[PDB]
A = this chain, B = another copy of it.
Amino acid sequence: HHHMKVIETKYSGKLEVAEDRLIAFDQGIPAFEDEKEFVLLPFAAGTPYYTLQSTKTVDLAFIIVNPFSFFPEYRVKLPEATIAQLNITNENDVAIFSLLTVKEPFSETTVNLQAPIVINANKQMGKQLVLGDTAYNRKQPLFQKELV
C-alpha cells in the first residue's frame, strides 16, 4: 500500500503528494502562526527553485530558493533550540530555503537572508528561523552573488 493525499496548489492545480512529504510547522510561520502544515514543491530536478505550499489554504504558497545556490558566502547558524524543535540529529537532515520577493522585472527580485525556512524532511518538521545577530539583508538582490 501507499499513502497519498490530493493537495490543491496555488500554481499547479490539484497534485497527488505522498503523505511523508507533509511537513509539520508546529509553530506555523511568523504572521501565519495557524498554518501548521506545508509541502515542498520543487520546480525541477537540479534547480534551486521551489514553492512552499500550505496544505490547507490553496492561495498560501511561498516562492523560495536554496540560497546556497545563489550566494557562495551564505551560512546559517542553527541554534540548539531550533535543533531540538525540529528533531535534528545530523547535518544531512537539514534543508535551508529563503523567501523571494518577486518583482517586475524579475531581475529586481530580492531574497530574505535573515529568516530562512529550515526543514528536517526525515522527521517532517519545519519552521522559519529568524537570525538576529547577522549582517544579512532582508532584501538581498537575487542576482547579486555578493552579500549586502
Contact = CB atoms under 8 A, between A and B. Distances in A.
Interface of A: 10-17, 41-49, 51, 61, 63, 69-70, 72, 102-107, 143-144
A60 to B, nearest CB: 13
Q: How many copies does the complex hold?
A: 2
Nearest to A45: B11
Contacts of A49: 43, 47, 49
Listed residue (A16, A43, A49, A143) with the most chain B CB atoms within 10 angstroms of its CB: A43
19 contacts: A10-B44, A11-B43, A11-B44, A12-B12, A12-B41, A13-B17, A43-B43, A43-B49, A44-B61, A44-B63, A44-B102, A46-B63, A46-B102, A46-B106, A47-B49, A49-B49, A69-B107, A70-B107, A143-B144
